[PDB]
Amino acid sequence: YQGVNCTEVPVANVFQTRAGCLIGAEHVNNSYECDIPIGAGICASYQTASQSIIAYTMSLGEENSVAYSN
Amino acid sequence: NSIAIPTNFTISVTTEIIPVSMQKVSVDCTMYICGDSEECSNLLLQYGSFCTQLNRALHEIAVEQDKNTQEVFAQVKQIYKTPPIKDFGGFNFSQILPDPSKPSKRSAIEDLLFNKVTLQKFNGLTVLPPLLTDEMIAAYTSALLAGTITAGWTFGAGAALQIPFAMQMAYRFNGIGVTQNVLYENQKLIANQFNKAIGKIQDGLSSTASALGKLQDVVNQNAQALNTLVKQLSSNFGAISSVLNDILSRLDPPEAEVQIDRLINGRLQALNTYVTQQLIRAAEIRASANLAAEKMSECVLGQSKRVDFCGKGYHLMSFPQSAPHGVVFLHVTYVPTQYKNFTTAPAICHNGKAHFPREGVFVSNGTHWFVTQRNFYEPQIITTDNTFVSGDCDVVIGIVNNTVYDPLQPELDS
Amino acid sequence: NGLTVLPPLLTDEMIAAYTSALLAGTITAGWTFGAGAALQIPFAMQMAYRFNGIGVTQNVLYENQKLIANQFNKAIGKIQDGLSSTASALGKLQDVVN
Amino acid sequence: NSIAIPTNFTISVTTEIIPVSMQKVSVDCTMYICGDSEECSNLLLQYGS
Amino acid sequence: QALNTYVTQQLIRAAEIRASANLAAEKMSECVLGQSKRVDFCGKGYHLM
Ligand SMILES: *[C@@H]1O[C@H](CO)[C@@H](O[C@@H]2O[C@H](CO)[C@@H](O[C@@H]3O[C@H](CO)[C@@H](O)[C@H](O)[C@@H]3O)[C@H](O)[C@H]2NC(C)=O)[C@H](O)[C@H]1NC(C)=O
Ligand SMILES: *[C@@H]1O[C@H](CO)[C@@H](O[C@@H]2O[C@H](CO)[C@@H](O)[C@H](O)[C@H]2NC(C)=O)[C@H](O)[C@H]1NC(C)=O
Ligand SMILES: *[C@@H]1O[C@H](CO)[C@@H](O[C@@H]2O[C@H](CO)[C@@H](O)[C@H](O)[C@H]2NC(C)=O)[C@H](O)[C@H]1NC(C)=O
Ligand SMILES: *[C@@H]1O[C@H](CO)[C@@H](O[C@@H]2O[C@H](CO)[C@@H](O)[C@H](O)[C@H]2NC(C)=O)[C@H](O)[C@H]1NC(C)=O
Ligand SMILES: *[C@@H]1O[C@H](CO)[C@@H](O)[C@H](O)[C@H]1NC(C)=O
Ligand SMILES: *[C@@H]1O[C@H](CO)[C@@H](O)[C@H](O)[C@H]1NC(C)=O
Ligand SMILES: *[C@@H]1O[C@H](CO)[C@@H](O)[C@H](O)[C@H]1NC(C)=O
Ligand SMILES: *[C@@H]1O[C@H](CO)[C@@H](O)[C@H](O)[C@H]1NC(C)=O
Ligand SMILES: *[C@@H]1O[C@H](CO)[C@@H](O)[C@H](O)[C@H]1NC(C)=O
């Protein structure tokens, strides 16, 4: 439900995001690459009980270390 | 028989601004047209699939905006951390590198540009947030800048090593026809000029917010268009009233439906005009975004030989900075200065032979003749190593007598 | 009653002057255009520089300057004759106007 | 095992033309639509902007 | 309706003409003030001036 807070409208998977009220998606906090855009950095995917759609914050890419020396 | 050759140079840093994206807007057709009136909604059913087309066009524009943003910024496979050592060849990148909480007294150009740009629930309209937040844009920019600074020419398919900055600068100097022995002799002055230019740019940006007119115009035009569309709701278009309830209450259906039809036609025209103009503007902004992506690829990740594509002078390197709905580039360029006058000849007449320089031009100090590069005065004695030999002294116009030396004979005699 | 055409800001003479200044600067000066060196590089030196640019050695220009100049002049004359004969070679501008 | 190399060269000059600017036009909207009659303009004022 | 149609046509033509003008400015900068290595960007053959 775009541009809507979850306090009012669903009464009229409950979770509140910057893009709106999202129903049906399980929220994890391990970042991945974006699969289905949602908005404001939130991306969702279907990720295999409980083979459900998950919602996560998009990851910009793997980090790279590089030694230092003059 | 005269030629001018530089004896000095300066390092110049300039600025360029390009818009990238636009605001994403979605509109409810029925809410704007009728506004919770059942008779109007029933009458609107006779027009087929207008609202569908309008919504589809707006949705396509909204998608294209994020497409443009990801085309421009998402060019980097990996994330490069800022090296915890700031010991470069005397160059301080503090004002352009980030700071996790930004607690330093030195503000990044990002904050200055952001503040310079900075300085409804009842309508049928909606505005959507972009897919990428500002923090992710800043992260992409910082990673790209740090990777360019650290890995040098091994940025792509890179390794776990850091090419020293002075070597990169020397290679870039070689790129434009100046030998690196020039850089290795006044690196200190080079760094001082670079730092002074960066400071001047920061002060100039902090002076005024009027330099961002290109980015301001997009916002102004979009707001003007939206305000015009909203204000168009109050017109009568020849009907009795601009409020549906007044028409319903004051008249019977057999004329109220005609008045409502008139109002419907007017508001449909308004919506069509707005959407067409938005489509054209979206095309323009896509062209601008393509230009921005090309410039990033061809000037930030490498050195360009195209004249005046990356500012005036000879291109050395450039750095990107993020901005609201746009990007900012900082081009570093080489500019020759303090010219001098000399006498030149096309070739040198030795004993029956004509000698041409392998590189550079022949110059005369009034007494002695030398060969030097065309962008920095550095004379050398005319050796048979430096001179390409072909032909005789007959056909070349303006050839001049002189003596060509040979290191071999004194070595042989000893 | 209601239609008006406005004049362009820059007149034709100004455009011609801009073109003349640009070409004179590019011809008289060489790679020193821009920075006010203002000495005058000989033209054959610029031609040799360009010849080195396209991958041939400048002695080939210095040994055939006369023939090269003759060919250049003949090409310019051919362009003049071609322009004088057909006055409809400018299609795109005419299409815009139409 | 065979290659070809030029022995003479020629100089060619060609031309190309590019449009830059359009004709500049302004239109008196109200005078065009109404032809300077007050009855038309009074009704036109009800169409907004 | 007539006025609206004319205005829209003019807008599209203006977009086309400004694209052409951008090409013209780029060509001026790349070709008149320097030597270009891009193939056939400055006519056929190898560019001199
Ligand atoms: C070039 O890099 C150097 C670091 O290598 C930067 O030096 C630091 O600059 C900041 C602000 O420009 C200085 O903070 C100020 O210091 C004065 C000194 O009294 C103080 O009165 C102010 O209240 C403020 O704290 C900082 O001290 C300085 N540090 C060092 C070690 O020099 C420099 O800023 C960089 N260049 C530019 C143009 O920013
Ligand atoms: C031109 O070269 C001269 C040296 O040949 C530079 O002169 C020095 O400039 C610095 C400025 O940072 C002064 O502090 C020195 O006192 C100058 N020394 C001499 C002997 O003049 C000059 O800076 C160069 N030109 C430019 C524009 O930098
Ligand atoms: C410098 O070059 C000139 C080229 O003209 C030489 O002049 C000729 O020299 C030959 C013998 O070397 C004479 O037979 C000619 O009569 C000269 N012609 C002219 C116009 O002077 C000149 O000799 C060269 N200088 C030296 C020292 O050899
Ligand atoms: C190719 O180059 C040669 C030069 O080595 C040209 O030979 C001269 O050409 C001019 C005019 O074309 C004649 O007036 C000369 O008599 C030629 N000299 C000789 C020794 O033959 C040759 O003509 C050039 N080819 C073309 C088609 O112009
Ligand atoms: C939640 O409700 C508050 C209270 O008005 C509102 O400010 C906020 O925008 C709502 N959340 C979202 C995501 O809209
Ligand atoms: C992720 O969330 C779980 C609870 O939902 C929490 O225990 C864990 O610490 C979080 N980890 C991170 C990295 O946020
Ligand atoms: C580079 O680091 C080394 C130590 O790894 C140090 O000895 C050297 O002085 C440093 N070079 C500069 C220019 O600071
Ligand atoms: C070199 O000297 C001449 C006259 O001696 C003068 O006209 C010319 O301007 C000088 N060169 C420069 C670059 O000023
Ligand atoms: C020109 O420079 C050379 C080498 O620097 C020197 O030998 C010669 O004397 C100079 N010319 C004059 C007229 O002093």
Swiss-Prot record, chain D:
Residues bearing attached sugar chains per UniProt: N8
All disulfide bonds of the chain are C34-C40
Q: Which domain of life is it from?
A: Viruses
Q: What does this protein do?
A: Precursor of the fusion protein processed in the biosynthesis of the S protein and the formation of virus particle. Mediates fusion of the virion and cellular membranes by functioning as a class I viral fusion protein. Contains two viral fusion peptides that are unmasked after cleavage. The S2/S2' cleavage occurs during virus entry at the cell membrane by host TMPRSS2 or during endocytosis by host CSTL.
This one is known as Spike protein S2
Question: Gene symbol?
Answer: S
